[PDB]
Amino acid sequence: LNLKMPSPSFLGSTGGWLRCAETEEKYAMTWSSDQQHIFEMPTGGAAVMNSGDNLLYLARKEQALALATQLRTQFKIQDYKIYRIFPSGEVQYLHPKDGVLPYQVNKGREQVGRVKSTIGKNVNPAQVKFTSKATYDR
Amino acid sequence: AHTVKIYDNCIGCTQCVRACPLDVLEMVPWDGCKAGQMASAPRTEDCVGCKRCETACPTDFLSIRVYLGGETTRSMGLAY
Amino acid sequence: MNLKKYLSTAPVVATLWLFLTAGILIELNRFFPDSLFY
Amino acid sequence: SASYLPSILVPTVGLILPFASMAILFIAIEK
Amino acid sequence: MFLISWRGYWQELIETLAWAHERTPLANLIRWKDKPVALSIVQARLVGLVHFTVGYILTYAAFVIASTAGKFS
Amino acid sequence: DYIKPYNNDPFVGHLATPINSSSLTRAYLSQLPIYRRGVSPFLRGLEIGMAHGYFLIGPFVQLGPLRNTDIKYLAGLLSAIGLIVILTLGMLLYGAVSFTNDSQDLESVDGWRQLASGFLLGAVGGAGFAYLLLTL
Amino acid sequence: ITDNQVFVALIMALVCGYLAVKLAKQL
Amino acid sequence: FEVSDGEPYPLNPAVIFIALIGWSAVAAIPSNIPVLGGTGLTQAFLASIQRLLAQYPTGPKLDDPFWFYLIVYHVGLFALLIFGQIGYAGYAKGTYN
Amino acid sequence: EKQVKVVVDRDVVPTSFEKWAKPGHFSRSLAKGPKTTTWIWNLHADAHDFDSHTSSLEEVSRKIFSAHFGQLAIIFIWLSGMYFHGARFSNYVAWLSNPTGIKPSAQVVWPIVGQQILNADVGGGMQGIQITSGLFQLWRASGIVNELQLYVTALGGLGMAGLMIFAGWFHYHKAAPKLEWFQNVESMLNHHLAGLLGLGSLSWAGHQIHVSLPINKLLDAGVAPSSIPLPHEFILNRNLMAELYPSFQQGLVPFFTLNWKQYSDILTFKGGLSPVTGGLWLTDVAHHHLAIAVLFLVAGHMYRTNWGIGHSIKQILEAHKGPLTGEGHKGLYEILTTSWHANLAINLAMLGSLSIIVAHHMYAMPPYPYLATDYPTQLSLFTHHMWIGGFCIVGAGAHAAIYMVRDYSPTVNFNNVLDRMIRHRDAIISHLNWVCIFLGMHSFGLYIHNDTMRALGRAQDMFSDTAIQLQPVFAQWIQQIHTLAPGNTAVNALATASYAFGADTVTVGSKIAMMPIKLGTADFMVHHIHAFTIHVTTLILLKGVLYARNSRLIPDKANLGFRFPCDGPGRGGTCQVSAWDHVFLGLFWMYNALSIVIFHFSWKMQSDVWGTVTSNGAISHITGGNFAQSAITINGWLRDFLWAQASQVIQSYGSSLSAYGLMFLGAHFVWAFSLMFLFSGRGYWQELIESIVWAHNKLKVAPAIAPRALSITQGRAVGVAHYLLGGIATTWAFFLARIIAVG
Ligand code: CLA
Ligand code: CLA
Ligand code: CLA
Ligand code: CLA
Ligand code: CLA
Ligand code: CLA
Ligand code: CLA
Ligand code: CLA
Ligand SMILES: CCCCCCCCCCCCCCCC(=O)OC[C@H](COP(=O)(O)OC[C@@H](O)CO)OC(=O)CCCCCCCCCCCCCCC
Ligand SMILES: CC1=C(/C=C/C(C)=C\C=C\C(C)=C\C=C\C=C(C)\C=C/C=C(C)/C=C/C2=C(C)CCCC2(C)C)C(C)(C)CCC1
Ligand code: SF4
Ligand code: SF4
Ligand code: SF4
């Protein structure tokens, strides 16, 4: 979204996204600030975030999330959005995906990957042998 | 394609979500603890298996278990 | 200024006890050298 | 005796067979 | 080598090598079909154990044969 | 100030340094058998091979195991031809797995096949020419 | 071991290889 | 000429000429020492060049004085060239200190 | 302008034993009780890490100034011990009478368990352990002739240690300087350049001119040590100095009249080694100290301190800027004034490099008398300084990584050399890795190729003098230039700086002191092996320092810390990813490189330099020219060096060298025990400890401190420590036994 959004003043570096990002997934982070702070790029270096709107591209989701973590910790910036761009050009909203931080309980979220009882009740591997079932599956 | 599974012993402390570096976990309403929240893993496709959540879990035996299964580009943490 | 408690700590007490044990062994070995088969 | 058999087989099994097998194996694993 | 150094130093090293290969002219045409990656943790233990085992057996085999030969031959 | 991002767009995994990108560097990297405009894959392969085999013969003839015998040049030429054959085999394998059926633009199976054929022919011819020069 | 004997052994080895290639392809 | 990307680079042959003349004049000062034989290193180096050129096929061996003259002459000439380009571009062209 | 003033806090910390009874008081986590056995290890692991205790730079600076005093006191106690051992339990006077025949020794073993055999018949009446530390040669060069002087020096050292103890306690409990102090780098540099080094060398030069020169001159003239006048007599009675050196007749007048050339009797530049003792001419050494003192004193007035004159390091750093380096060295001044880890990294790298240079220069140009003839001392000193230098270099890399992970700041490091380097760290490490691969192939592959050729009987296809030759033409050329320097580029020098470059050989006591060290194909290959190993170890350290904060695998390594085990079994595996682990690997590589370096020095010296000389000049080395054709193959390195020279350390049983043999075996055990901690993980040990704890529980004998296995990082540290200890001890015992039994 808003691919024409201004980018932080960075001088290059050799740790940015490679050709693989061109033909595959490429993450982007767009955040807004009020002061031209200096932040350590996740790829190695120092950049100045333009006062107003900042948009940068990365090759991994973890890199964008780490940058967001430092923007939220080193600075009191919580309006950071992480999107994913595919070679076709369709953008995908990844972080926070709902406008609320993941560790902040919010309504409308459906529990995924839940197992009844504690792990001590998991079946033995011998009981699910030669079948498409796992121990954690009840 | 690692499988992250949350068990009923979860106390809803959110430490797993706070310690996850890939936004794979989140907090959802629940009624199994006073916190009224439970950990969920709806974005396990982005998990890499670092097990930071397992380390950040306070329950006696980890209420969140990450099983290393299918390996993909996201799980291998390849920037190239 | 509780020097006794420090002297009672594990490293100090252990080194003192092992030093005394080694001294006893050495003293016995010079007064009674090449001891074998009691 | 066939003193020529070793001279014809050692190079084949040491140079021909390995290269050919590696090529076919590479094609099989890649495709 | 594999029994001491574990995966992580080699992963970063391979990333550096990957950057070098895809950033050098006249060699960019050649593209790896499988993304280079460091030997797995367990794979490293098995490779190192195989190397250590092969060396142990071959070293003692050469020693015993050569010694028993030269001594009585 | 000379060091800049490769495409003037930061966040890229490359830098536009002097020898990395320059008038002289861009001109030299370009016009080579590979990367040159208006050159068929076979022509590129022929040029590359005739330039590769020429210097490949040198090592075998000069430091080959038979470098002191009267057939040092012939033995080195044969060794270079064998190495060229192995390299051509590698090239063909790469083209067989990496590329698929599409237009011949050096990035297809047919394009890389033509490039490999040209490389083999050029390398053999270059090795032969170097051997002839050494003999004469 | 005459040369002809060695050739006969080689032929039998080739037959064994063919059988072992068929057995492996079937598996 | 462009040193990097679209940024121009000022190249001046006068820099090479001034560096060469300056270093030759500095090295042309006579020195009554056995290696130089009572003459500047420039004269000795040129003399060695002529001597070795007479026997074009055979080059100078390890004990030939030519190598010492070559290294010292090149050390100084390259230093004047590097420092000269630094001074010309940094101060004359405004590239700054 | 900033006032370079001293401000201190009085009674900042009380002196009491209350905190001694509370281990872990310096750490908030360690002060809550152990609860497990891991706390015991963590207590010592974070004891000297003053940066982790508090977040104030002032407190860390004070904790460093003190403890520096404590280490200085420890060094003074060790020096006092060496002097006392020389005065009480050593044959120093006997050695002075016959330096070539008497073996140095300053240790006497007590007769208790048959260990009395270690008292070797070193001569001089007493029997003890032969010391290879060069203490005897150093004392002789210093003018010591009687044991009374050694006793006085030991007492003075003890007093200096007491002073360094009092100073350390006083600068932490009575007068602790504020952070403004310790940040005056200009003043600290001026004083260390003109007072600690300049004035120090000046004073040593004066001592040599008034004590070392005359005493050594009389010693080398056949005068008995007891008949030589006391050092104070040479100062009180100027007639003696005038007789030994006519230059003293003129006095100090020539110095003040610029007629320095009148000091040609005491301030000489001969250049070579003394033919009587085999060491450097003490006059050249005194003149050298005088010149280095004057040069350091002049250099000590560069920076600006409390006056208008001088220079500002920050201004000089910021002034250096170019097109290829945007901000140049901007921000580095603040980096070296706000982080002790950065200063420690730079200083450790330089100190280690200085130690290595010291080793080379000390063996090539023996400075002390009779040092060259005592091959055991030469081998031990070169090997010792080589090892301490390598250890300090690895430590330099480790501290660079520590600073990068903890004290780094993006604002300070903006567009500067450090930031610009971190930006292209991938180019640096990939190109360096390529260089390492090329070096390894072209260095070890040559050795492997020679092994394959010799085994196949194809000796005509080897990389040797007879077969394909690889002559170090550049190094040989530099040697020839050095050989001709005393007459064409060193007009006032009367001889080549080192006889190792050329000239002629020197023999003292029917033993070779220093002869030209000719370089051949074997030296070409070994030198390339050295370069290859240095490149790989520097690659490991540089990689760990450049990626210490982040990488494409772990985007936030800095948040994880400098010393952490791993990020888990994710992303394929992130084991040994932290910078600390890079230092852990660099230790093994540095050990390998240094081991090969010391191996080359030992073998080359014993085969082409060290040896005996028969009347008429015939030379016979310990291993006659075997290094020329045996050092070109791994088999030769295993047969002619590791197997042939080990016979002395394995057959040492039953003699005074038996101890070495024992240490030769013990070291092996340790080196083999390290494997336990290097090829294993703490998960298995924790389970084994669980079973053992159950056994204890069954008998009501379980300990309150829950037994736990060694941490992953602690396990790696223990493994590397044992590996290095065993390897260095094995090569130590082998070197000492081999050099003492023969030569
Ligand atoms: C090696 C010869 C040499 C040296 C030492 C200098 C030095 C200097 N030049 Mg200069 N220059 C040179 C050659 C040299 N130049 C030539 C050949 C040209 C013609 C193209 C110019 C044209 C030129 C211009 C147009 C200007 C300068 C300026 C300057 C000063 C600005 C700062 C600087 O350049 O860095 C060096 C600063 C130093 C203080 C010297 C430090 C040297 C270090 C400590 C040791 C160097 C050892 C060296 C490598 C030894 C080499 C071997 C030897 C045998 C030669 C400086 C003192 C500028 C000026 O006038 O000042 C404002 C300027 O405007 N230069
Ligand atoms: C920090 C290093 C250091 C230290 C602590 C000392 C310390 C000492 N040096 Mg010394 N020295 C050093 C380094 C050092 N030196 C160095 C680097 C050199 C150059 C290599 C010298 C060379 C040197 C010499 C040659 C002498 C000393 C002497 C001395 C002692 C007395 C100096 C003095 O005041 O006599 C002062 C002597 C003078 C001549 C004063 C000069 C001006 C007078 C007043 C001339 C006026 C005429 C008047 C009538 C005197 C006639 C004197 C004439 C006959 C010589 C003293 C303990 C002297 C000594 O005691 O010998 C044992 C001695 O002669 N030093
Ligand atoms: C730690 C255990 C230990 C034990 C059980 C002994 C026991 C004994 N020692 Mg002994 N000793 C020890 C340690 C020990 N020593 C140490 C560490 C040293 C220093 C290396 C000595 C040095 C020593 C000497 C020189 C002598 C003895 C002697 C004796 C016997 C004399 C009778 C006696 O009852 O005195 C009991 C003694 C002690 C319990 C130990 C006290 C040691 C003190 C510090 C005296 C040593 C002074 C030393 C020379 C200088 C300062 C040392 C410093 C630590 C303060 C004896 C049974 C004497 C002997 O041979 O009998 C014929 C004798 O001549 N010891
Ligand atoms: C496993 C089987 C195997 C076999 C049969 C050979 C056989 C040979 N090797 Mg080799 N080698 C092997 C494994 C093998 N190697 C392995 C695993 C390694 C790596 C450790 C090496 C490393 C090695 C090196 C480094 C060298 C050899 C060399 C040689 C040749 C030396 C013979 C000689 O002394 O005269 C010399 C005979 C000649 C110079 C004539 C050249 C004959 C060529 C190479 C064969 C014809 C090829 C042909 C033109 C191509 C196919 C036909 C084409 C028309 C389509 C010989 C033909 C040496 C050599 O000469 O290289 C060429 C040499 O330098 N080998
Ligand atoms: C890595 C170290 C090393 C080196 C330097 C050599 C070198 C050599 N070996 Mg040897 N070998 C080695 C390891 C090594 N070997 C090992 C480990 C083994 C045991 C497996 C052997 C076993 C072996 C055998 C059996 C034989 C040799 C032989 C030889 C000689 C001829 C080989 C040949 O023809 O290759 C061919 C080389 C090439 C085709 C090309 C080399 C690469 C070029 C020159 C690099 C140029 C790069 C360029 C500068 C880049 C910039 C250019 C661009 C900008 C334009 C040669 C001197 C033969 C011999 O008789 O010995 C004398 C022989 O029979 N070797
Ligand atoms: C000419 C003055 C001078 C001298 C000679 C020294 C000498 C030394 N300094 Mg020092 N320093 C000075 C001025 C001086 N400093 C000033 C003005 C500052 C403030 C800007 C500092 C701040 C400073 C720090 C922060 C540290 C040192 C340290 C050291 C020691 C380095 C370790 C070593 O190399 O072992 C060599 C040891 C010797 C050769 C033994 C000589 C020791 C004697 C006592 C000479 C030192 C005199 C002392 C500076 C002043 C006496 C004060 C008086 C009231 C008693 C060394 C003894 C380091 C250290 O080790 O801490 C203790 C260290 O941490 N210095
Ligand atoms: C002037 C030199 C110097 C100084 C002042 C420091 C200072 C420091 N170092 Mg460093 N370091 C150095 C050199 C130095 N180092 C060298 C040469 C190396 C390479 C070996 C290292 C490698 C290194 C690493 C990897 C680390 C440090 C760390 C630290 C910090 C904490 C140390 C600590 O508390 O551990 C406590 C010390 C011990 C528990 C002692 C360990 C004993 C070892 C095994 C040595 C045994 C030697 C002995 C001869 C063995 C034989 C006798 C035996 C039979 C008993 C501290 C500020 C640590 C840090 O920064 O914290 C995160 C850190 O991780 N250092
Ligand atoms: C020299 C090499 C070496 C040595 C000596 C050992 C020794 C041991 N291993 Mg072992 N191991 C090794 C290599 C080695 N390993 C390697 C390469 C691997 C592959 C990773 C393993 C993996 C392994 C496993 C998986 C296990 C062991 C176990 C054991 C212990 C077995 C029980 C026993 O015999 O206790 C007797 C004690 C000894 C033999 C040590 C000697 C006693 C010491 C020297 C005395 C104390 C120190 C002394 C006072 C001197 C120091 C003083 C100080 C001031 C410095 C034993 C301590 C097993 C175990 O834990 O047993 C319960 C276990 O399960 N090892
Ligand atoms: C080419 C002539 C030099 C001979 C080579 C050996 C020189 C020894 C110095 C090492 C650095 C190399 C010199 C170029 C480097 C150099 O001085 O460039 C010039 C430039 C310094 O000029 P600036 O305008 O930046 O000056 C401003 C600052 O220096 C302020 O002091 O340095 C760089 O910015 C690039 C640094 C390394 C660039 C990558 C090269 C890495 C290769 C390392 C191997 C070198 C060759 C190995 C020996 C064969
Ligand atoms: C690194 C270096 C360098 C290098 C250079 C070079 C390398 C050059 C060149 C070159 C080359 C490397 C060349 C080659 C060549 C070849 C040729 C010139 C040929 C030819 C021709 C012919 C005769 C042909 C024929 C044929 C035939 C027979 C048939 C088939 C086809 C053909 C066509 C192939 C320089 C100096 C820069 C710098 C420094 C060092
Ligand atoms: S293993 Fe790591 S990435 Fe996966 S859910 Fe746990 S913390 Fe998140
Ligand atoms: S899984 Fe663990 S850390 Fe996450 S909410 Fe449940 S108890 Fe807390
Ligand atoms: S437990 Fe050990 S092997 Fe597994 S990820 Fe952690 S450090 Fe690596």
Short mmCIF file of N, CA and C in Angstrom, two decimals, chain I residues 153-201:
data_model
loop_
_atom_site.label_atom_id
_atom_site.label_comp_id
_atom_site.label_asym_id
_atom_site.label_seq_id
_atom_site.Cartn_x
_atom_site.Cartn_y
_atom_site.Cartn_z
N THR I 153 66.87 -6.41 45.13
CA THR I 153 65.87 -6.22 44.10
C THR I 153 64.58 -6.93 44.47
N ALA I 154 64.68 -8.13 45.04
CA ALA I 154 63.48 -8.85 45.45
C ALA I 154 62.74 -8.07 46.54
N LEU I 155 63.48 -7.52 47.50
CA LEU I 155 62.85 -6.75 48.56
C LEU I 155 62.18 -5.51 47.98
N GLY I 156 62.85 -4.84 47.04
CA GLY I 156 62.26 -3.68 46.41
C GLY I 156 61.00 -4.03 45.66
N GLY I 157 61.00 -5.20 45.01
CA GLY I 157 59.81 -5.63 44.30
C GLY I 157 58.66 -5.88 45.25
N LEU I 158 58.95 -6.49 46.40
CA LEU I 158 57.90 -6.72 47.39
C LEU I 158 57.34 -5.39 47.88
N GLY I 159 58.22 -4.41 48.11
CA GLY I 159 57.76 -3.11 48.54
C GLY I 159 56.90 -2.44 47.47
N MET I 160 57.31 -2.58 46.20
CA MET I 160 56.53 -2.00 45.11
C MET I 160 55.17 -2.68 45.02
N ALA I 161 55.11 -3.98 45.30
CA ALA I 161 53.84 -4.68 45.28
C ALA I 161 52.95 -4.16 46.40
N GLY I 162 53.53 -3.93 47.58
CA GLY I 162 52.75 -3.38 48.67
C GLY I 162 52.22 -2.01 48.32
N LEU I 163 53.04 -1.21 47.63
CA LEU I 163 52.60 0.11 47.21
C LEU I 163 51.46 0.01 46.20
N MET I 164 51.55 -0.95 45.27
CA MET I 164 50.50 -1.14 44.28
C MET I 164 49.25 -1.74 44.91
N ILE I 165 49.37 -2.29 46.12
CA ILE I 165 48.21 -2.80 46.85
C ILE I 165 47.51 -1.64 47.54
N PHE I 166 48.31 -0.81 48.20
CA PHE I 166 47.79 0.36 48.89
C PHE I 166 47.16 1.33 47.90
N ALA I 167 47.80 1.53 46.75
CA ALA I 167 47.26 2.44 45.74
C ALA I 167 45.92 1.94 45.23
N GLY I 168 45.81 0.63 45.00
CA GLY I 168 44.56 0.07 44.52
C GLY I 168 43.44 0.23 45.52
N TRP I 169 43.74 0.02 46.81
CA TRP I 169 42.70 0.17 47.82
C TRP I 169 42.35 1.64 48.04
N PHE I 170 43.36 2.51 47.99
CA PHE I 170 43.17 3.94 48.20
C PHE I 170 42.37 4.59 47.08
N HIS I 171 42.53 4.11 45.85
CA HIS I 171 41.81 4.69 44.72
C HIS I 171 40.41 4.11 44.55
N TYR I 172 39.93 3.36 45.53
CA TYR I 172 38.57 2.82 45.50
C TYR I 172 37.82 3.04 46.80
N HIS I 173 38.50 3.18 47.94
CA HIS I 173 37.86 3.42 49.22
C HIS I 173 38.24 4.74 49.86
N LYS I 174 39.28 5.41 49.38
CA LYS I 174 39.71 6.68 49.95
C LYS I 174 39.66 7.84 48.97
N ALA I 175 40.00 7.62 47.70
CA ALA I 175 39.97 8.71 46.71
C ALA I 175 39.69 8.09 45.34
N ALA I 176 38.42 8.09 44.95
CA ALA I 176 38.02 7.53 43.66
C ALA I 176 37.81 8.66 42.66
N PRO I 177 38.55 8.73 41.56
CA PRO I 177 38.34 9.84 40.61
C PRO I 177 37.00 9.75 39.90
N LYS I 178 36.48 10.92 39.51
CA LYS I 178 35.21 11.00 38.81
C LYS I 178 35.40 10.66 37.33
N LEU I 179 34.28 10.51 36.62
CA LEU I 179 34.36 10.18 35.20
C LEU I 179 35.08 11.24 34.38
N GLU I 180 35.08 12.51 34.81
CA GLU I 180 35.83 13.50 34.05
C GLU I 180 37.28 13.04 33.97
N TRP I 181 37.79 12.48 35.06
CA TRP I 181 39.10 11.87 35.05
C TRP I 181 38.90 10.55 34.31
N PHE I 182 39.96 10.04 33.69
CA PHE I 182 39.93 8.83 32.86
C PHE I 182 39.44 9.16 31.45
N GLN I 183 38.83 10.33 31.26
CA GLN I 183 38.36 10.73 29.94
C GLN I 183 39.31 11.74 29.32
N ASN I 184 40.39 12.07 30.04
CA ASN I 184 41.43 12.98 29.57
C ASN I 184 42.42 12.11 28.81
N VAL I 185 42.05 11.75 27.58
CA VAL I 185 42.92 10.89 26.79
C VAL I 185 44.16 11.63 26.30
N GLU I 186 44.07 12.94 26.09
CA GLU I 186 45.24 13.70 25.66
C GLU I 186 46.31 13.69 26.75
N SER I 187 45.91 13.98 27.99
CA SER I 187 46.86 13.99 29.10
C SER I 187 47.42 12.60 29.36
N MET I 188 46.55 11.58 29.35
CA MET I 188 47.00 10.22 29.59
C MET I 188 48.02 9.81 28.53
N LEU I 189 47.76 10.15 27.27
CA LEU I 189 48.70 9.81 26.21
C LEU I 189 50.00 10.58 26.34
N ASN I 190 49.93 11.88 26.63
CA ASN I 190 51.16 12.67 26.77
C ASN I 190 52.04 12.09 27.87
N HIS I 191 51.44 11.78 29.02
CA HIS I 191 52.22 11.23 30.12
C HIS I 191 52.77 9.85 29.81
N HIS I 192 51.96 8.97 29.20
CA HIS I 192 52.45 7.64 28.89
C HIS I 192 53.52 7.66 27.81
N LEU I 193 53.49 8.66 26.93
CA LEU I 193 54.47 8.74 25.85
C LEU I 193 55.77 9.38 26.33
N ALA I 194 55.69 10.37 27.21
CA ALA I 194 56.88 11.05 27.71
C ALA I 194 57.32 10.59 29.09
N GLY I 195 56.41 10.08 29.92
CA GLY I 195 56.79 9.65 31.26
C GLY I 195 56.91 8.16 31.50
N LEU I 196 55.93 7.38 31.04
CA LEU I 196 55.98 5.94 31.26
C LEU I 196 56.95 5.25 30.31
N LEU I 197 57.02 5.71 29.06
CA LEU I 197 57.90 5.12 28.06
C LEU I 197 59.12 5.98 27.77
N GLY I 198 58.93 7.28 27.55
CA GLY I 198 60.05 8.16 27.27
C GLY I 198 61.02 8.23 28.43
N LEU I 199 60.55 8.71 29.59
CA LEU I 199 61.43 8.79 30.75
C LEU I 199 61.90 7.42 31.19
N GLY I 200 61.08 6.38 30.99
CA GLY I 200 61.50 5.05 31.38
C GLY I 200 62.70 4.59 30.57
N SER I 201 62.63 4.77 29.25
CA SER I 201 63.76 4.39 28.41
C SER I 201 64.96 5.28 28.70
#
